[PDB]
């Protein structure tokens, strides 16, 4: 796999979003991967609905957190609407999928990346954006303004985001905290070192949609 990958430059990443005062990161994370795989497979970049996952994936806990892989299975075994059709509200409400007409996109499944394995994660990223988790509770992550983030942090993951590229010293992550945080809403997290968990536990639990 090459030294640089950046799905933004291939038109496979939509603008940075803001989950606001709702623990819906898991839904944002899943949607980034869906937006990515749809562009790669069909040539169209669309925005898909985090709100639908928030309201409809009842294995997850709405604004109290949830599971990217559970969200991704919903899209494959049910489907997902466009963001325009089912926009983000920042509060969990009833599932309105039926009320909003047929799905816009469907996936053919979900796969997990081999955990605690930097190359496996990079190989996956070279193929498509990947949902990843990390520890975000530390002030260092919260206050990140730019540069290669090395921590300090532990491995107690609590935040779902999406990896959309990498380069020699980093993995490039799209966060859902608005465009003021980090590097225009992104973070470059240090990679390469002697760390099987990854910086901030980045290699703990990573998924991607399958299509088509």
């Amino acid at each position: 796999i090459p030294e640089y990958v950046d799905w933004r430059q291939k038109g496979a990443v939509t603008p940075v979003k803001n989950q606001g005062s709702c623990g819906s990161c898991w839904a944002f994370s899943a949607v980034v991967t869906i937006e990515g795989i749809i562009k790669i497979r069909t040539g169209n970049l669309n925005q898909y609905s985090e709100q639908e996952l928030l309201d409809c994936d009842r294995r997850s806990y709405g604004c109290n957190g949830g599971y990217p892989w559970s969200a991704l299975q919903l899209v494959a075994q049910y489907g997902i609407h466009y963001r325009n059709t089912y926009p983000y509200e920042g509060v969990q409400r009833y599932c309105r999928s039926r009320e909003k007409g047929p799905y816009a996109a469907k996936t053919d499944g979900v796969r997990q990346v081999q955990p605690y394995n930097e190359g496996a994660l990079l190989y996956s990223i070279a193929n498509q954006p990947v949902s990843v988790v990390l520890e975000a509770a530390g002030k260092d992550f919260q206050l990140y303004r730019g540069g290669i983030f090395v921590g300090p942090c532990g491995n107690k993951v609590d935040h779902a985001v999406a990896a959309v590229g990498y380069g020699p010293n980093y993995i490039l992550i799209k966060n859902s905290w608005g465009t003021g945080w980090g590097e225009n809403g992104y973070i470059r997290i240090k990679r390469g070192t002697g760390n099987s968990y990854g910086v901030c536990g980045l290699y703990t639990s990573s998924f991607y949609p399958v299509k088509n």
Partner: peptide, 5 residues
């Protein structure tokens, strides 16, 4: 799994 800012 998974934070608000």
């Amino acid at each position: 799994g998974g934070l608000s800012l």
